Amino acid sequence: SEPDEICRARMTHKEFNYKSNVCNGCGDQVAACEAECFRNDVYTACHEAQK
Secondary structure, three states: OOHHHHOHHHOOHHHHHHHHHHHHOOOOOHHHHHHOOOOOHHHHHHHHHOO
16 A cells, blocks of 8 residues: 555556646646645646646
8 A cells, every 4th residue: 555556546547647647737736736646626726727
């Protein structure tokens, strides 16, 4: 049960890769965005900000 191990084990690779790209495109909030497996308001803000 590692940091980004348990989270991944609950999601598919396609979903994990997709969301990861969204958070990575968020800027310096990468870690914040990644905090809750992309389940956070920053993720929404970042995701909504990306076309």
